[PDB]
Symmetry: D2
């Protein structure tokens, strides 16, 4: 048996799977978990794949890129996603996390997919809310957007940010789809003094990119090695990966030159 994902209008991927473990459709989302001989378990969340085998990669990368570049981490915000592993890694810091996901049904259906599901859901500092209006208002130190946000989502989130604030969001892969990344950066630049694209080194499995945005916090210059070396039980993240994540070939640097708010 096999399943397929379109990573491009001219490129698909075929995955051999040994079984279908779960299926839960919602009035807004559809999730399906498959058993994989390669990735252990593959979760298909609305035309996007998640490999149980490599949940530590993106979770460790985003969480610690934020954590190790911020002097103070007390309030975090995570919108537009179901990734509780990000949360598990962020808790390796002394911080509070506000998770906003309206789709409980889908979210709870990850009960076995995410290794640290319970450890995250039962954290005293972890508060899960259906929507934004369900949270005490305040300004955060780090905001995460799990789906490429638009100009509005960007603005709405930028005001909920502290002067010191940092915003890490998702976009397409800078090489495969430089035009998408270019647009994602332009949007980010409109309100942030620091807008820089990066990727997950060695994570050769997804057409995905990311942007590190802020008002006055540089992702390379404000990296604090001591916070890095102090982290425990990390299997992917380190300083080499962090810096390498921002490497760009010659041409691409030229292409994103003025959209890159370094």
């Amino acid at each position: 048996m096999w399943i397929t994902q379109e990573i491009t209008p001219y490129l698909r991927k075929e995955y051999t799977i040994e079984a279908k473990l779960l299926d839960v459709r919602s009035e807004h989302n559809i999730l399906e978990i498959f058993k994989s001989k390669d990735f252990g378990e593959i979760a298909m969340l609305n035309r996007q794949l998640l490999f149980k085998n490599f949940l530590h990669i993106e979770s460790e990368l985003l969480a610690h890129m934020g954590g190790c570049t911020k002097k103070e981490l007390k309030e975090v915000l995570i919108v537009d996603g179901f990734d509780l592993e990000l949360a598990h890694q962020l808790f390796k810091y002394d911080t509070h996390i506000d998770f906003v996901q309206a789709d409980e049904k889908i979210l709870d259906s990850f009960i076995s997919f995410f290794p640290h599901f319970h450890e995250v859901k039962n954290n005293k500092n972890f508060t899960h809310a259906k929507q934004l209006l369900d949270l005490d208002i305040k300004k955060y130190d780090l905001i995460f957007c799990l789906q490429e946000p638009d100009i509005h989502r960007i603005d709405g989130l930028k005001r909920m940010l502290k002067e010191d604030g940092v915003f890490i969001s998702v976009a397409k892969h800078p090489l495969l789809e430089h035009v998408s990344m270019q647009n994602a950066l332009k949007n980010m630049g409109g309100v942030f003094s620091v807008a820089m694209p990066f990727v997950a080194p060695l994570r050769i499995l997804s057409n995905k990119g990311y942007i590190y945005a802020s008002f006055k916090t540089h992702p390379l210059k404000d990296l604090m090695t001591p916070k890095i070396e102090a982290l425990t039980s990390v299997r992917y993240y380190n300083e080499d990966i962090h810096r390498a994540a921002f490497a760009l070939p010659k041409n691409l640097q030229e292409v994103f030159k003025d959209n890159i708010k370094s």
Copy 2:
């Protein structure tokens, strides 16, 4: 119309193709070239894909990682492959290049696929040999193996090296095939004082890895930035990409610790 690419026994890539441009076949190799509306022409060599519009990435990376890490390039050896674009990039240096490939028929089949085909083959300093035995006896400043060599091939090429020479070869990607990479490193660690794995940053479309091995030349410590900046016409290679290529996830740095040599 589509073609496929087996990155793994449980994972495939599918490229929409507009036409088949060539179908050549020898006693040892078969080569097909297709037209894609996005990746330009795609060449399928023994189920290994080559992209015309992106040939420069791997050629510049491999050639210049060598050229910018060595004082002078006088004698270079290329074996087990058909990559004329690598020699083209190497000809930026005033060096001689010995190119061994018994399959003339397939090699010349690249007359249109390689944009610098004729320029490379007409170089006074380019020697195409059917086999290593037809070559003059001598040592090389740098040797390139375009296929994963077994420990016996390594032993053989190893001795055709100058004391300060560099041996660069291909291996499997360390993310999806760490066990393979590991073995590729121990086989190198056997006769070389330096043996470090690296990948091609931003190249998400390939399940391929490489090793920089030598007797004492260091891929990072012997890096000559002046040589890197002199390369004004390259489109991919730069210092950031050079260093970034050696970055390893924390767990891979650890599993590879024993075989890696700096």
Copy 3:
């Protein structure tokens, strides 16, 4: 390389092809010819396949099912199709043929696909017209509809029919899609006293069916063996295939019972 056709929302077919020989899109149709090791050449005409290898099967079947059941064959009409092979088989009778196809571009693009292209286009009795209004008006002895016609197309064609008239049209396969065939028959029954479904015995390659409609001509009882045995250069059609074409399993006979105007 390969191509794919959806024969069902839950069933597709994958065809290995060695090359793409032709591509001509029209302001109404799209045609693509592929070279096949199995079928010689595959023509993809707007989501439907044609196998050069087996053009004699359907052409011989429809042409002679009409021809050998009609006492007199002098005027024939063919609408909604590009199949000139039907025409080649019908000319094995002393009859005139009116081919109505507005898309000359696509039609002419079959120049090499249809074995008897020129022999049919240059027949003195073959008149090709862009539309119906481009033909002398008259009543025909046999009408062929190459695409499942609707209630209107059915009526419009039924009046252009002689008292003795016969109408052979296309529909889905009676077993795989009994609901479609059921509808096709109901429509036909509304105006014809004789409506009977049939298939191409042994032509296990398509989700296709056909209906033999008329006012007073039975496809099994009015079959004239002498006209059959008199036909020359036929490789598929004979009396066994003709009668077998109307065989229906027990259940299906019950399903189509009152829609079958035998």
Copy 4:
């Protein structure tokens, strides 16, 4: 989710599947059962597909072509297969059935797939043997080979036949694999006075053919319509389907002329 079926080295069928229901495996066979939203459950036995909702077609056809062409059914032999639905249909007659299949594990694996599983296995007159040698010595009125037998297997079963017995076996479809069918006929023509090929009408989803061979019983001339009409609970088999199964295209009647025996 999809699975595939290789009807030809250049042709494949792809079925959308909702779930995998079983994965059994023995020393000689592997069996997987899937749930399809249309064909009910699909069983994949050594890359040969079986459809639960349509098992009756082949079982009724094979059993009753024999039963309605013989005076009395007292001893029947089934070999080289797992088709219990064939025996079920044969039990409409008061006959004994010897069923040989060394792979008990896989056979019993059909406990839910075959709707009449238990009824067939609990029949006092059904004997399941691991091999032909564990059986009592005797002659059969009818023998069924569920796999294409080579000329050696034929020779062997041939002798376990009553003088007026019938040997029915599987072969390749004569439309796509005429050469194969041809050979299957000459091998039968070798020891049998009657040898005629036939297919399963309206069964477009299978690349399978069959042969009715005997010493003198004729599949059409010895057909007993009374026996056919007595079968009021069958859903497919009837006289029209019986005769229609032997119909051959004009060119196949000719190429097969020498090996076919009536």
